[PDB]
Amino acid sequence: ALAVPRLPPHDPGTPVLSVVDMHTGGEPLRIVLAGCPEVSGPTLLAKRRYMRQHLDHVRRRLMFEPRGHRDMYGAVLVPSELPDAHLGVLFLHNEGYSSMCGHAVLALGRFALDFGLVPAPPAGTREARVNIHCPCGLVTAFVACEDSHGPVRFHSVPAFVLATDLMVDVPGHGKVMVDIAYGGAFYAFVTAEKLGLDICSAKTRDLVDAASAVTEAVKAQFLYGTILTDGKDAYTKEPTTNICVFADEQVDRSPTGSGVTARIALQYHKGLLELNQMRAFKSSATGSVFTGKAVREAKCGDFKAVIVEVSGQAHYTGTASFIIEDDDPLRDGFLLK
Amino acid sequence: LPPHDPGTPVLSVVDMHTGGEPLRIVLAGCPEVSGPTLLAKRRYMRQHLDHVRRRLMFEPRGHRDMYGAVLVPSELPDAHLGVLFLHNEGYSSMCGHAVLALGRFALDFGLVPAPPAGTREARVNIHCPCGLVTAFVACESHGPVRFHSVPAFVLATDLMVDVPGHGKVMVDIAYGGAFYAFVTAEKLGLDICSAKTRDLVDAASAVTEAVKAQLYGTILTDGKDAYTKEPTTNICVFADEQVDRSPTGSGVTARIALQYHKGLLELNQMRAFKSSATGSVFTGKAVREAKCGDFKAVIVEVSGQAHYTGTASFIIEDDDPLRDGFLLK
């Protein structure tokens, strides 16, 4: 006898925040559809500043608990100054306001098409072009559709190797050799076996402690975080399993889009892989798979870089309406000390 | 709505929280939970509709610290509603502080007829797997909820224990609907007011494993068990090192028993308990003495505030490898 959809008791005068919940290989994304105050700014950068300095309570509500959690990520859609852009994105996380879109492009691309920010391509063509204005800059996502559903693919920034076979003394383990590469962020790459862990069986806590130790070691003796690998950097049809541990011991549920990019750069540099050769990357956390493909050579200062095609699937998970009660001490959310 | 698979019904939820711990009440889209009794229904859900639990409570649409409730008819004629609890570890029996949310819910959503205009609190009869709990909900429909504990008692006091990490420490074991070890945070060399959650968790975990060597989990305390108007801060670390967002309703119950036993508190004397995690406050009050075999128990009035956080529709894509959710382990 609750046929009629109703909201629960809330404070009228704080509008309802409405989201579409998506995920890209296990990492969630709340896209805000409605109930965010006007984000005033002549530019996306201006708008990012305004949100951080005026509407941060909105970020804290959607991303913090009790309505979110430690590994929740968010997106507020805004007009772009660029006439090329189908949409502008302000990214939200639990630590602040990110610049690197990364794999969220896969979800936002799919979203833009499915929600009509991008007109449907001619029935003859199947991949639609979505121009997303990140704080990063304009990223073009190519979304497969019918007349919709399928993989999304985007082209990386110039990705390169900063250092190879670098020996460091990681607390808890001996001197260890790491590669540091840029895939949109700086990651240390180590084999899990070289730290005395089986990536396929070991508890997440063990892989996190190990990877954290490497990240702290590299910080002093030379960086967004560390990726541990199964050590299958040798070309094969078999997927290669990696785990990304970044920031405050935070595990990525997806093969990091950045991580895929930097590993392809590393594989290219060691002569294990050629242009338009495609590997598959599997998440140790979730089992989801992204593909990388170096498409053309490039440069980044004096450094020989590569351009990488990352592709993967985003999925819809549902839709939420967030409300706040006048009384609630935890109206604007909380995070654990 | 987003593009979804038609033919898998939409799961619809009302998200609430009691002192920071969340509760998803399922409004619609759960298959018929077949069973002659609540017990039968809990069994059926665990053995046939577990995919529904995993969807609502797992990482894509939930998280490690998410809890859920499916409402069902009760066999008991007294009962306004029957509750099946869902969590990330399985199917709970402990009614718990979820009665605070469910009581408020039952009134606000008309499972309970509207109270008499004269009277400012309503009676909600909740059938938990444990049994029939009565919640008293303040109204004019918003306000705090209060319920009466089961028989709560002290199992052991000032017990020195073999802790791998700190050598030897004195702990109290009490029952508040579950068995909790109580130690002072300071006694493990931690300031409860400043220390990182990781530090307090690993300490409390160590005590829990140690006590097994001699139990739902361990509560670290402010040490302010001495009566005062000032609230007392506690942190509850139970099961697999999972922290409680609230002053545990069970925890409040057990320490009221412990405070009564040590002669720091009398009947109808009320303490306030503050969560180290979030800062939320539950009130405990021993109301009458009672018995549990030869053990002298107490009945405790636990009271707190539940708040609405919003509403979701969960969907499935037939393509999605993580349709049914996932956990890191």
Numbering used by the authors:
A (entry chain B): 4 to 150, 153 to 227, 240 to 354
B (entry chain A): 10 to 149, 153 to 226, 240 to 354
From the paper:
hL3HYPDH was first discovered by Visser and colleagues who identified, through sequence alignments between orthologs of the proline racemases family, the human protein C14orf149 (named after its gene locus and later named hL3HYPDH) which lacked racemase activity but exhibited instead proline dehydratase activity, converting trans-3-hydroxy-l-proline (T3LHyp) into Δ1-pyrroline-2-carboxylate (Pyr2C). hL3HYPDH is involved in the metabolism of hydroxyproline (Hyp), a non-standard amino acid present in the cell wall components of plants and in mammalian collagen and deriving from the post-translational modification of proteins by prolyl hydroxylase enzymes. While T4LHyp is metabolised following distinct degradative pathways in mammals and bacteria, the T3LHyp metabolic pathway is conserved in bacteria, plants and mammals, and involves a T3LHyp dehydratase (EC 4.2.1.77) which removes the hydroxyl group of T3LHyp without the intervention of a cofactor, leading to the formation of Δ2-pyrroline-2-carboxylate. Besides its role in the dietary hydroxyproline metabolism, hL3HYPDH has been also identified among the interferon-stimulated genes (ISGs) triggered by virus infection and showing antiviral activities.
Crystal screening and optimization of recombinant hL3HYPDH in absence and in presence of the substrate or the transition-state analogue pyrrole-2-carboxylic acid (PYC) produced crystals that best diffracted at 3.0 Å. The final hL3HYPDH model was reliably built between amino acids 10–354 (for chain A) and 4–354 (for chain B) except for residues 150–152 and 227–239 of both chains due to the missing or poor-quality electron density. Although hL3HYPDH crystallized in presence of the substrate T3LHyp or the transition state analogue PYC, examination of the catalytic centres of the two monomers did not reveal electron density attributable to these molecules. Unlike the structures of tlT3LHypD and of tcProR that both showed a closed conformation for the ligand-complexed monomer and an open conformation of the ligand-free monomer, both hL3HYPDH monomers exhibited an open conformation, consistent with the absence of ligands in both catalytic sites. Moreover, a hydrogen bond between Asp98 and Gln267 (3.4 Å) further stabilizes the open conformation; however, this interaction is lost in the closed state, as observed in the predicted structure, where Tyr76 and Tyr241 engage in an H-bond (3.2 Å). In hL3HYPDH, residues Met103 and Ser275 play a stabilizing role of the open conformation through hydrogen bonding of the hydroxy group of Ser275 and the sulphur of Met103 (3.0 Å), locking Met103 in an extended conformation and protruding it toward the free substrate-binding site.
